Write an enzyme that holds these catalytic residues in place. Structure first.
Site, PDB file in Angstrom:
ATOM      1  N   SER A   1       0.839  -1.192   0.000  1.00  0.00           N
ATOM      2  CA  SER A   1       0.000   0.000   0.000  1.00  0.00           C
ATOM      3  C   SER A   1       0.877   1.244   0.000  1.00  0.00           C
ATOM      4  O   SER A   1       2.067   1.186   0.323  1.00  0.00           O
ATOM      5  CB  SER A   1      -0.967   0.008   1.194  1.00  0.00           C
ATOM      6  OG  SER A   1      -0.270  -0.098   2.428  1.00  0.00           O
TER       7      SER A   1
ATOM      8  N   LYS B   1      -5.104  -4.939  -7.455  1.00  0.00           N
ATOM      9  CA  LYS B   1      -4.663  -3.599  -7.081  1.00  0.00           C
ATOM     10  C   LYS B   1      -5.874  -2.682  -6.963  1.00  0.00           C
ATOM     11  O   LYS B   1      -6.648  -2.547  -7.918  1.00  0.00           O
ATOM     12  CB  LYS B   1      -3.672  -3.026  -8.108  1.00  0.00           C
ATOM     13  CG  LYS B   1      -3.092  -1.652  -7.734  1.00  0.00           C
ATOM     14  CD  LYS B   1      -2.405  -0.921  -8.912  1.00  0.00           C
ATOM     15  CE  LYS B   1      -1.027  -1.487  -9.256  1.00  0.00           C
ATOM     16  NZ  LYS B   1      -0.293  -0.666 -10.289  1.00  0.00           N
TER      17      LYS B   1
ATOM     18  N   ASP C   1      12.215  -7.179  -3.418  1.00  0.00           N
ATOM     19  CA  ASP C   1      12.008  -7.955  -2.201  1.00  0.00           C
ATOM     20  C   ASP C   1      12.989  -9.111  -2.115  1.00  0.00           C
ATOM     21  O   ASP C   1      13.576  -9.358  -1.056  1.00  0.00           O
ATOM     22  CB  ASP C   1      10.575  -8.471  -2.147  1.00  0.00           C
ATOM     23  CG  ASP C   1       9.574  -7.364  -1.923  1.00  0.00           C
ATOM     24  OD1 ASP C   1       9.965  -6.340  -1.320  1.00  0.00           O
ATOM     25  OD2 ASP C   1       8.409  -7.517  -2.350  1.00  0.00           O
TER      26      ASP C   1
ATOM     27  N   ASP D   1       8.627   4.158 -15.413  1.00  0.00           N
ATOM     28  CA  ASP D   1       8.851   3.888 -13.994  1.00  0.00           C
ATOM     29  C   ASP D   1       9.482   2.511 -13.811  1.00  0.00           C
ATOM     30  O   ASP D   1       9.134   1.770 -12.886  1.00  0.00           O
ATOM     31  CB  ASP D   1       7.554   4.006 -13.183  1.00  0.00           C
ATOM     32  CG  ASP D   1       7.811   4.207 -11.690  1.00  0.00           C
ATOM     33  OD1 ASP D   1       8.909   4.684 -11.329  1.00  0.00           O
ATOM     34  OD2 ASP D   1       6.921   3.889 -10.871  1.00  0.00           O
TER      35      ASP D   1
ATOM     36  N   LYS E   1      11.996  -0.135 -12.540  1.00  0.00           N
ATOM     37  CA  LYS E   1      12.759  -0.262 -11.302  1.00  0.00           C
ATOM     38  C   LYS E   1      12.554  -1.682 -10.783  1.00  0.00           C
ATOM     39  O   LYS E   1      11.732  -2.443 -11.303  1.00  0.00           O
ATOM     40  CB  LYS E   1      12.334   0.781 -10.256  1.00  0.00           C
ATOM     41  CG  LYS E   1      10.826   0.793  -9.960  1.00  0.00           C
ATOM     42  CD  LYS E   1      10.483   1.839  -8.887  1.00  0.00           C
ATOM     43  CE  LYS E   1       8.974   1.955  -8.674  1.00  0.00           C
ATOM     44  NZ  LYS E   1       8.672   2.907  -7.566  1.00  0.00           N
TER      45      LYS E   1
END
Ligand SMILES: Nc1ncnc2c1ncn2[C@@H]1O[C@H](COP(=O)(O)OP(=O)(O)OP(=O)(O)O)[C@@H](O)[C@H]1O
Length: 286
Positions: free
Chosen positions: A25, A45, A100, A143, A145
């Site tokens: 979130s 989402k 992660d 974006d 990444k």
């Protein structure tokens, strides 16, 4: 085909959007893992800030990832646009984001040896190359990444998060935009000087990701630190766990490092295209 999913189905698959099913979130909204009533394992989402920043992101994915399928792009399975609510439904990727895994929770997770990271770099690159070359109009992700590289059951890379992607005609070199999009540590330097984006910008951001696979460190900078030690001892920048595997692939790592450096050039005209990046990865194995 893309499925129009009823809002109640998503309400109940996430147990009324209970916290127990929340897996992320902030900023964009919320992401929940769920099993649909047909058995499908999905990520759902929930977009916030509708009728503004939230609705534009919704249409950005609908007009890009929602219109294409590719083995290295997260499949968008469905959507739900009911009044104020904006939701998007993706196939669930087993091992989560590369960020992660790379920065493991409590230093625990899936161990990524070089053979797998190299596969991740090639897959990621093929995904972006499909967006820049095979899609007409081209798609600028804007974006890229490591949190936006997901890993499925086979540890294959699948590019995700098209909330900021934009369509650009093939007869254009850049796209003039209204806002500055990107994440600290990934922004191409020319994005700070001009309200313009390009596929060469995605290439820059892809370069940062390939550096994360090589060094194992977070971008927040990392790009400059590698550029400084590149003129000194480039043996002291790679991920130490990769040198434990075999010090004989240090030559292969340096060749991948050169690819990353070329992607990270301050000049957009000097960066490779993702098609050149793919070709370069192939010549290293030949
Ligand atoms: N299809 C999916 N399968 C499995 N996990 C997912 C999927 N989509 C998102 N996630 C998980 O949900 C989290 C949020 O994803 P999302 O890309 O929307 O966030 P983000 O904007 O990248 O967050 P940040 O960049 O701040 O880390 C990620 O950590 C990711 O691991």
């Amino acid at each position: 085909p893309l499925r129009k999913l009823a809002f109640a189905d998503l309400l109940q698959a996430t147990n009324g959007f209970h916290n127990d099913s929340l897996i992320g979130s902030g900023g964009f909204g919320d992401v929940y893992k769920a099993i649909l009533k047909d058995g499908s394992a999905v990520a759902i989402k929930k977009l916030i800030h509708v009728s503004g920043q939230g609705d534009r992101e919704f249409m950005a994915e609908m007009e890009t990832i929602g219109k294409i399928k590719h083995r290295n792009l997260v499949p968008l399975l469905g959507y739900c646009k009911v009044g104020d609510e904006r939701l998007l439904v993706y196939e669930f990727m087993k091992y989560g984001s590369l960020e992660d895994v790379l920065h493991d929770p409590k230093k625990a997770g899936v161990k990524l040896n070089w053979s797998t990271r190299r596969k991740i770099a090639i897959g990621s690159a093929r995904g972006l190359a499909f967006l820049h070359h095979n899609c007409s109009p081209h798609i600028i992700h804007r974006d890229m990444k490591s949190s936006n590289v997901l890993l499925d059951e086979n540890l294959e890379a699948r590019v995700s998060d098209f909330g900021m992607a934009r369509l650009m005609s093939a007869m254009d070199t850049h796209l003039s935009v209204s806002t500055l999009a990107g994440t600290p540590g990934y922004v191409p330097p020319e994005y700070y000087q001009s309200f313009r984006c390009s596929t060469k910008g995605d290439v820059y951001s892809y370069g940062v990701v390939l550096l994360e696979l090589l060094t194992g460190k977070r971008p927040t900078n990392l790009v400059g630190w590698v550029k400084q030690h590149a003129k000194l001892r480039i043996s002291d920048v790679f991920d130490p766990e990769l040198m434990k595997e075999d010090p004989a692939l240090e030559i292969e790592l340096l060749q991948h490092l050169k690819v990353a450096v070329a992607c990270l050039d301050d000049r957009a005209w000097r960066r490779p295209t993702m098609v050149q990046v793919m070709a370069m990865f192939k010549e290293i194995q030949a």
